[PDB]
């Protein structure tokens, strides 16, 4: 405890060398307060170090960080870490209550006055003051209100000074005229409201203003950029080349999407004050996602965790006019690679859940657009199961939408298109099957060993690849399938029963959009009359293919008697008469044909899966 | 025009379906693919705008897939015409035809299952050039490497997976300075400018699994170009995409498990890996980390005698400065827990650290399973710590204070109480629980933990709250047959802290157990009243198989044995006879089996209840079902 008292002699009889030292030590007691922040002797060490940290924070603010410069600098941030480290919870036997006002205040000035650098460590620590000593400092809260109003009243004249009216040797700013500091304001403003509630209505109000104007505001170049890609009728995405500083825009955009994010928060409980603003949120929504860089995907993703939330609460009927640009990969996802790599799933799932709600009121070009995509969509090669499942329940529900339009053509076509996606996803699944029963014995064999894995040749694993794998056979590996713990034949059963069960209905919709009057039906027997009629050639060829491939999947559920339980097991046997059931609701005709044709594969088919 | 360009290529298709005629020949003049690929490209963009009359779209949907398949088949003749292929991809590429699987289906097949390591070392080069001239977009580039180079490169490290130390003469030195010269030598005048075109992510990642692939499988080829190599991985490190940076990590590290590298280089990637506060890419630091922990006493070596080496200060100096950040700590402890060896020296600044943090990583009221298996592993390498210092003393050795074993043993009975899975018991109707009750037998062992056990009491807060709670009491002398009553949680809960109990007594003195006998049996009252199997099972059953290999005794029959060869034998005798007059034979003839192995005098005067049980429900019963059986 020596070093302790010698330290704190120093520093009292000093109101480089000196500097280094004393800073080194101040650090070092920062560090090891753990074994001092518990105990009694907390007063003491808070009155004794009080009185120097107002002394020295009084100074002038220091601009350059070098040398003796960046030695206070570390030196007052290491200091002033302690109070955001040190325990100030609302205990009992808590000491720091009764000498709170002059350090707020005195915290204040300095974030009024202080750099970056130092202005987002005292909001820190002013907050979390803020959440502890409200006890008796509960008579200052309007000081922060005015500071933090104030700070999103200039907002707009730093941006124009930054872009309109525009490391070591570089001159710092003032705290007033920062992104990030600014990007800092909704949490700390957030957690205040939750703190108090006794000084919380007007400054809903007088913060509406703010956030209308802080999200209408935008960039010429940016602006200019995205007229002139209006005018040659492309859509221009990315950060315009003529911003010279790219930081400050990630930075503005950073800014942008929390204020978007305190705006959601906010809509919970007082959308009345916002109904005002609600009719253009869609078009700063789509802007915002235009407007990311392709480098932040942190950001991309709180945006659609806040798009989410303003969806949940029923305001998702103004979306409508904007969805067929929502539906672009382009302005949904972008160029960046990480984005592609791990955020797909939950940007095309949100937009799934969106169309859901509002299917009864989707225009063609929509419905159009929609099965296009979510067709793609299903066809993917992602590792999992997941996207599939969901882009496939997404058609089988949007398939009683698409019935109900006006015109039977585009509806009889649109049901085809679906079908033939469904008979393509089969035949790839058919192609993965000796991988995937590999894949799946590998993994067994893995697990049973039970030993660590390294990311290094063995000469007890050989390299057995075929033509699925070898197309994935590089050493870095971005997820794990341990993680997952995946099996690549239950995934493949899964997605299977849940395409054949929606067959059915896929049918029976098209059952009802015989076109009038197309083709006669004088006399046909009564179990052929509420059937699919007026199939051309090439949608046989559809239906030939379906059962083709349909039938060859059922191997991944690996004499013909079974009068107890053999072979087949009970789900499989239901499959199938779910699977035959199908094909009763066509011509009769077109039955005939088809099963004709197809009797020699399927019994080559009976050779190699009995259960047939 | 378009019915007619849908009935050429339907004529066409058709043509070329008999391929055993050596009528092919059509397809080798070259003015024919070239009308062809024109006339599809206008069918294509047709199709991708909404401009055909409906009658069309089927047929034209059907019309694509067929000229694709004329293309591909035309390519298949002559394998080793590159210029074809090379225009197909750039076609593809560029969003003028849609693809079919064809094209990969021959490109394996007919490239990377070449059996002549000619035509291998040529389609290379050629792809490199392709890569290095400045004219092939961004998706061609990305396509090659994907589809062409890398899987030629697996293909022949396949192939020569021979005992004796079998070389690559496909890997020749021409290859390797082409690949040094065309990516690793190329110091990008302005990198950062590069990204301003889309797609160049992709391949980035691409050049990097083939730069990682050679050094995992090759290494003994790059002893020239170590430096360049060094360079490149480094320059790679300042990309901003985080998956680009993490990959780029891996190579180094790689690079740092097969090669000599300045200590200098290693703890500055190490302090960068173990900074990272970013969720992506988890999976990539996790292997950068696994890579480079095992080469670390090589490539770091500290004076004898000295137990604070620099890459074990570090993780302490970040969990110091990033204690409030919770991922950091969850990070910090998964890269700990799988290297216990590595830091049993160290154990003196990280026991502590582990121990207070236990509540933080993982918190009573409803924690993830990803918690509570981290927690269990912290434990667990104490345990294994422990374990090491005991056995190799048996073959100042810094010791926990009691504080932190007490707070320990107290977060490891709170934790096994309120966990979600059950023990298993034969009587269960029809793994975090096994290990923690295997870590908290060992750990009270004598020569361990054990002599803390003396003043140990039964916790009395959570053992009153869980079977003393009115609810609880409730809930255990209800009919097992109401599901209303049958809470699973509550029973699990109860379960495992009757599991806990037995095990703690199983240690306990004789003299203890005689002096707090009032204790015990308010605490055990309301349980052996119960009519459930489950709880006289772990009352009074104790078998090797559910045990775990463990020798633990009964509660009822170590109470029974503490008692002098009573004032506990005659209440155990009150029990069973209350509980045999109501019929619930469950609780009585468990009782008295106990009894009776304790002491047979005490089952005279039970003699009439047990035979009239016999002769009236049990026998009765089960002669009358198998009667019953024997009538179906």
């Given at each position: 405890m020596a070093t302790s008292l010698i330290e704190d002699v120093v520093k009292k009889l000093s109101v480089y060398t000196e500097l280094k030292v004393k800073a080194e030590a101040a650090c070092a007691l920062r560090d090891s307060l753990d074994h001092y922040t518990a105990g009694p002797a907390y007063p003491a060490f808070l009155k004794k170090v009080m009185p120097v940290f107002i002394h020295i924070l009084r100074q002038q603010p220091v601009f350059q960080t070098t040398g003796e410069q960046g030695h206070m600098q570390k030196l007052r941030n290491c200091i002033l870490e302690i109070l955001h480290r040190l325990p100030t919870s609302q205990t009992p036997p808590e000491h720091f209550e009764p000498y709170a006002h002059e350090i707020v205040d005195l915290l204040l000035e300095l974030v009024r006055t202080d750099n970056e650098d130092n202005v987002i460590l005292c909001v820190k620590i002013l907050s979390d003051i803020m959440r502890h000593q409200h006890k008796i400092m509960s008579g200052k809260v309007q000081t922060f209100l005015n500071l933090i109003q104030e700070l999103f009243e200039q907002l707009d004249k730093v941006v124009r000074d930054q872009l309109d009216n525009t490391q070591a040797n570089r001159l710092l700013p003032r705290g007033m005229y920062s992104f990030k500091v600014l990007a800092e304001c909704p949490i700390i403003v957030v957690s205040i409201f939750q703190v108090h509630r006794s000084a919380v209505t007007p400054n809903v109000k007088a913060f509406v203003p703010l956030i209308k104007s802080a999200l209408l505001c935008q960039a010429k170049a940016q602006d200019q950029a995205h007229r002139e890609a209006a005018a040659r009728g492309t859509i221009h995405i990315g950060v315009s080349p003529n911003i010279k500083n790219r930081a400050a825009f990630g930075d503005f955009i950073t800014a942008q999407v929390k204020t978007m994010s305190f705006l959601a928060y906010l809509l919970r409980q007082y959308s009345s004050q916002l109904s005002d603003f609600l009719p253009h949120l869609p078009d700063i929504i789509v802007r915002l996602l235009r407007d990311c860089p392709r480098d932040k995907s942190s950001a991309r993703k709180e945006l659609f965790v806040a798009i989410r939330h303003i969806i949940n609460f029923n305001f998702r009927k103004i979306f409508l006019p904007k969805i067929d640009e929502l539906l672009d990969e382009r302005t949904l996802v972008g160029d960046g690679l990480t984005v592609h790599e791990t955020m797909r799933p939950l940007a095309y799932s949100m937009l799934a859940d969106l169309i859901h709600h509002v299917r009864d009121q989707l225009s063609p070009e929509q419905i159009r657009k929609t099965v296009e995509v979510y067709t793609r969509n299903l066809q993917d090669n992602f590792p999992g199961t997941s996207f599939q499942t969901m882009s496939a329940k997404l058609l089988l529900n949007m398939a009683e939408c698409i019935a109900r339009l006006p015109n039977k053509v585009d509806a009889r076509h649109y049901l085809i298109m679906i079908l033939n996606a469904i008979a393509d996803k089969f035949a790839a699944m058919n192609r993965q099957y000796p991988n995937a029963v590999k894949l799946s014995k590998q993994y067994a064999q893995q697990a049973a060993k039970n030993v660590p894995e390294t990311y290094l040749a063995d000469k007890e694993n050989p390299p057995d690849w075929d033509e699925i794998d070898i197309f994935n056979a590089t050493p870095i590996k971005i997820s794990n399938p341990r993680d997952r713990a995946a099996d690549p034949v239950v995934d493949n059963k899964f997605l299977f029963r849940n395409l054949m069960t929606g067959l059915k209905n896929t049918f029976y919709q098209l059952k009802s959009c015989n076109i009038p009057g197309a083709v006669d039906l004088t006399g046909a027997?009564?179990?052929?009359?509420?059937?699919?009629?007026?199939?051309?050639?090439?949608?046989?060829?559809?239906?030939?293919?379906?059962?083709?491939?349909?039938?060859?999947?059922?191997?991944?559920?690996?004499?013909?008697?079974?009068?107890?339980?053999?072979?087949?097991?009970?789900?499989?046997?239901?499959?199938?008469?779910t699977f035959a059931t199908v094909f009763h609701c066509i011509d009769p005709a077109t039955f005939h044909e088809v099963f004709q044709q197809e009797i020699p594969r399927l019994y080559e088919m009976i050779h190699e899966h009995t259960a047939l | 025009k378009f019915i007619a360009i849908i009935n050429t290529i339907n004529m066409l298709d058709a043509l070329c379906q008999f391929p055993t005629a050596n009528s092919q020949s059509?397809?080798?003049?070259?003015?024919?693919?070239?009308?062809?690929?024109?006339?599809?490209?206008?069918?294509?963009?047709?199709?991708?705008?909404?401009?055909?009359?409906?009658?069309?779209?089927?047929?034209?949907?059907?019309?694509?897939?067929?000229?694709?398949?004329?293309?591909?088949?035309?390519?298949?003749?002559?394998?080793?015409?590159?210029?074809?292929?090379?225009?197909?991809?750039?076609?593809?590429?560029?969003?003028?035809?849609?693809?079919?699987?064809?094209?990969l289906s021959h490109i394996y097949n007919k490239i990377i299952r070449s059996d002549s390591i000619d035509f291998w070392r040529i389609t290379i080069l050629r792809c490199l050039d392709i890569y290095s001239g400045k004219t092939a977009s961004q998706r061609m580039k990305w396509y090659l490497l994907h589809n062409i180079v890398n899987p030629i490169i697996a293909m022949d490290v396949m192939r020569t997976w021979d005992d004796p130390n079998k070389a690559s003469r496909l890997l020749d030195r021409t290859v390797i300075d082409s690949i040094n010269t065309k990516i690793w030598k190329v110091n990008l005048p302005d990198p950062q400018e590069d990204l301003l075109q889309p797609r160049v992510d992709h391949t980035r990642m691409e050049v990097l699994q083939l730069s990682?692939?050679?050094?995992?499988?090759?290494?003994?080829?790059?002893?020239?170009?170590?430096?360049?190599?060094?360079?490149?991985?480094?320059?790679?490190?300042?990309?901003?995409?985080?998956?680009?940076?993490?990959?780029?990590?891996?190579?180094?590290?790689?690079?740092?498990?097969?090669?000599?590298?300045?200590?200098?280089?290693?703890?500055?990637?190490?302090?960068?890996?173990?900074?990272?506060?970013?969720?992506?890419?988890?999976?990539?630091?996790?292997?950068?980390?696994?890579?480079?922990?095992?080469?670390?006493?090589?490539?770091?070596?500290?004076?004898?005698?000295?137990?604070?080496?620099?890459?074990?200060?570090?993780?302490?100096?970040?969990?110091?400065?990033?204690?409030?950040?919770?991922?950091?700590?969850?990070?910090?402890?998964?890269?700990?827990?799988?290297?216990?060896?590595?830091?049993?020296?160290?154990?003196?600044?990280?026991?502590?650290?582990?121990?207070?943090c236990l509540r933080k990583v993982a918190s009573p009221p409803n924690p993830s399973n990803d918690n509570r298996k981290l927690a269990l592993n912290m434990m667990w390498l104490i345990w294994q710590w422990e374990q090491r210092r005991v056995e190799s003393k048996l073959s100042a050795e810094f010791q926990i204070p009691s504080v932190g074993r007490h707070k320990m043993i107290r977060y490891l009975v709170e934790f096994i109480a309120q966990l979600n899975e059950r023990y298993p018991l034969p009587s269960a109707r029809p793994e975090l629980c096994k290990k923690a009750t295997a870590l908290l037998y060992n750990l009270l062992q004598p020569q361990y933990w054990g002599d803390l056990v003396e003043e140990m009491d039964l916790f009395p807060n959570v053992t009153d709250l869980v079977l003393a709670g009115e609810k609880s009491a409730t809930l255990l002398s209800a009919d097992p047959s109401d599901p209303e009553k049958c809470d699973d949680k509550l029973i699990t809960s109860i379960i495992n802290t009757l599991q806990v109990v037995r095990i703690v007594l199983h240690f306990k003195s004789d003299r203890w157990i005689l002096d707090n006998m009032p204790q015990i049996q308010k605490i055990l009252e309301k349980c052996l009243k119960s009519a459930n199997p489950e709880i006289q099972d772990c009352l009074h059953m104790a078998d090797r198989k559910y045990d775990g290999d463990r020798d633990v005794k009964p509660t009822i029959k170590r109470i029974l044995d503490a008692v002098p060869e009573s004032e506990l034998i005659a209440w155990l005798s009150g029990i069973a006879t209350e509980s045999m007059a109501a019929g619930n034979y469950v609780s009585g003839i468990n009782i008295l089996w106990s009894l009776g192995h304790r002491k047979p005098s005490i089952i005279d005067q039970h003699i009439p209840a047990i035979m009239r049980s016999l002769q009236s429900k049990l026998a009765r019963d089960h002669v009358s079902h198998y009667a019953a059986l024997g009538h179906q």
């Amino acid at each position: 405890m020596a070093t302790s008292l010698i330290e704190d002699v120093v520093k009292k009889l000093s109101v480089y060398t000196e500097l280094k030292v004393k800073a080194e030590a101040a650090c070092a007691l920062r560090d090891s307060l753990d074994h001092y922040t518990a105990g009694p002797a907390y007063p003491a060490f808070l009155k004794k170090v009080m009185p120097v940290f107002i002394h020295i924070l009084r100074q002038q603010p220091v601009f350059q960080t070098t040398g003796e410069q960046g030695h206070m600098q570390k030196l007052r941030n290491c200091i002033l870490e302690i109070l955001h480290r040190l325990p100030t919870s609302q205990t009992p036997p808590e000491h720091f209550e009764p000498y709170a006002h002059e350090i707020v205040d005195l915290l204040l000035e300095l974030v009024r006055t202080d750099n970056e650098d130092n202005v987002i460590l005292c909001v820190k620590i002013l907050s979390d003051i803020m959440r502890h000593q409200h006890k008796i400092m509960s008579g200052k809260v309007q000081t922060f209100l005015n500071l933090i109003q104030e700070l999103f009243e200039q907002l707009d004249k730093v941006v124009r000074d930054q872009l309109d009216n525009t490391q070591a040797n570089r001159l710092l700013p003032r705290g007033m005229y920062s992104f990030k500091v600014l990007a800092e304001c909704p949490i700390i403003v957030v957690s205040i409201f939750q703190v108090h509630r006794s000084a919380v209505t007007p400054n809903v109000k007088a913060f509406v203003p703010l956030i209308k104007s802080a999200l209408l505001c935008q960039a010429k170049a940016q602006d200019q950029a995205h007229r002139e890609a209006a005018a040659r009728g492309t859509i221009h995405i990315g950060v315009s080349p003529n911003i010279k500083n790219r930081a400050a825009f990630g930075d503005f955009i950073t800014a942008q999407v929390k204020t978007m994010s305190f705006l959601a928060y906010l809509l919970r409980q007082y959308s009345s004050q916002l109904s005002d603003f609600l009719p253009h949120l869609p078009d700063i929504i789509v802007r915002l996602l235009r407007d990311c860089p392709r480098d932040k995907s942190s950001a991309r993703k709180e945006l659609f965790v806040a798009i989410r939330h303003i969806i949940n609460f029923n305001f998702r009927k103004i979306f409508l006019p904007k969805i067929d640009e929502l539906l672009d990969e382009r302005t949904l996802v972008g160029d960046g690679l990480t984005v592609h790599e791990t955020m797909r799933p939950l940007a095309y799932s949100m937009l799934a859940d969106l169309i859901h709600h509002v299917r009864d009121q989707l225009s063609p070009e929509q419905i159009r657009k929609t099965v296009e995509v979510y067709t793609r969509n299903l066809q993917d090669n992602f590792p999992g199961t997941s996207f599939q499942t969901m882009s496939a329940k997404l058609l089988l529900n949007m398939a009683e939408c698409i019935a109900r339009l006006p015109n039977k053509v585009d509806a009889r076509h649109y049901l085809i298109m679906i079908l033939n996606a469904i008979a393509d996803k089969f035949a790839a699944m058919n192609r993965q099957y000796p991988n995937a029963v590999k894949l799946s014995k590998q993994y067994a064999q893995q697990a049973a060993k039970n030993v660590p894995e390294t990311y290094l040749a063995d000469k007890e694993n050989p390299p057995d690849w075929d033509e699925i794998d070898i197309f994935n056979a590089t050493p870095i590996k971005i997820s794990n399938p341990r993680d997952r713990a995946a099996d690549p034949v239950v995934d493949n059963k899964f997605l299977f029963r849940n395409l054949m069960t929606g067959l059915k209905n896929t049918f029976y919709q098209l059952k009802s959009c015989n076109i009038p009057g197309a083709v006669d039906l004088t006399g046909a027997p009564a179990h052929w009359t509420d059937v699919a009629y007026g199939f051309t050639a090439e949608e046989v060829k559809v239906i030939a293919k379906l059962f083709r491939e349909g039938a060859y999947v059922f191997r991944y559920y690996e004499y013909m008697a079974n009068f107890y339980m053999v072979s087949s097991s009970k789900e499989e046997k239901e499959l199938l008469e779910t699977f035959a059931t199908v094909f009763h609701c066509i011509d009769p005709a077109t039955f005939h044909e088809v099963f004709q044709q197809e009797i020699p594969r399927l019994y080559e088919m009976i050779h190699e899966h009995t259960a047939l | 025009k378009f019915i007619a360009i849908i009935n050429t290529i339907n004529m066409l298709d058709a043509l070329c379906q008999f391929p055993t005629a050596n009528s092919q020949s059509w397809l080798d003049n070259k003015e024919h693919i070239e009308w062809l690929k024109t006339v599809g490209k206008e069918l294509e963009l047709q199709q991708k705008k909404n401009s055909l009359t409906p009658n069309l779209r089927l047929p034209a949907h059907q019309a694509s897939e067929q000229l694709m398949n004329i293309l591909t088949k035309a390519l298949d003749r002559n394998p080793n015409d590159l210029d074809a292929l090379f225009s197909l991809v750039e076609g593809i590429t560029s969003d003028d035809f849609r693809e079919t699987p064809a094209l990969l289906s021959h490109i394996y097949n007919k490239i990377i299952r070449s059996d002549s390591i000619d035509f291998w070392r040529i389609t290379i080069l050629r792809c490199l050039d392709i890569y290095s001239g400045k004219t092939a977009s961004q998706r061609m580039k990305w396509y090659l490497l994907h589809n062409i180079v890398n899987p030629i490169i697996a293909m022949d490290v396949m192939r020569t997976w021979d005992d004796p130390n079998k070389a690559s003469r496909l890997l020749d030195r021409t290859v390797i300075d082409s690949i040094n010269t065309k990516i690793w030598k190329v110091n990008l005048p302005d990198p950062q400018e590069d990204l301003l075109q889309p797609r160049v992510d992709h391949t980035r990642m691409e050049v990097l699994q083939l730069s990682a692939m050679l050094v995992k499988y090759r290494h003994a080829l790059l002893q020239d170009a170590r430096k360049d190599f060094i360079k490149f991985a480094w320059t790679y490190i300042r990309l901003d995409d985080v998956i680009n940076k993490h990959a780029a990590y891996v190579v180094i590290g790689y690079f740092i498990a097969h090669y000599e590298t300045p200590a200098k280089i290693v703890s500055q990637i190490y302090f960068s890996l173990l900074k990272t506060n970013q969720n992506e890419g988890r999976a990539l630091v996790t292997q950068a980390l696994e890579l480079m922990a095992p080469v670390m006493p090589k490539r770091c070596p500290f004076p004898p005698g000295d137990r604070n080496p620099v890459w074990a200060l570090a993780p302490r100096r970040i969990l110091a400065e990033e204690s409030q950040n919770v991922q950091q700590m969850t990070a910090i402890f998964h890269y700990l827990v799988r290297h216990p060896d590595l830091f049993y020296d160290t154990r003196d600044k990280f026991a502590m650290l582990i121990i207070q943090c236990l509540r933080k990583v993982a918190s009573p009221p409803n924690p993830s399973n990803d918690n509570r298996k981290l927690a269990l592993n912290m434990m667990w390498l104490i345990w294994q710590w422990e374990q090491r210092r005991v056995e190799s003393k048996l073959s100042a050795e810094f010791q926990i204070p009691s504080v932190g074993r007490h707070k320990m043993i107290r977060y490891l009975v709170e934790f096994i109480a309120q966990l979600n899975e059950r023990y298993p018991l034969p009587s269960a109707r029809p793994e975090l629980c096994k290990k923690a009750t295997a870590l908290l037998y060992n750990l009270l062992q004598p020569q361990y933990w054990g002599d803390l056990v003396e003043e140990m009491d039964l916790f009395p807060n959570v053992t009153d709250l869980v079977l003393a709670g009115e609810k609880s009491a409730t809930l255990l002398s209800a009919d097992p047959s109401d599901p209303e009553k049958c809470d699973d949680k509550l029973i699990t809960s109860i379960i495992n802290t009757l599991q806990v109990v037995r095990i703690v007594l199983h240690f306990k003195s004789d003299r203890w157990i005689l002096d707090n006998m009032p204790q015990i049996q308010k605490i055990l009252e309301k349980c052996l009243k119960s009519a459930n199997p489950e709880i006289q099972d772990c009352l009074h059953m104790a078998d090797r198989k559910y045990d775990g290999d463990r020798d633990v005794k009964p509660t009822i029959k170590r109470i029974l044995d503490a008692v002098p060869e009573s004032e506990l034998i005659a209440w155990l005798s009150g029990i069973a006879t209350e509980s045999m007059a109501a019929g619930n034979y469950v609780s009585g003839i468990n009782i008295l089996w106990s009894l009776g192995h304790r002491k047979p005098s005490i089952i005279d005067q039970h003699i009439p209840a047990i035979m009239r049980s016999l002769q009236s429900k049990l026998a009765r019963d089960h002669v009358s079902h198998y009667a019953a059986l024997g009538h179906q």
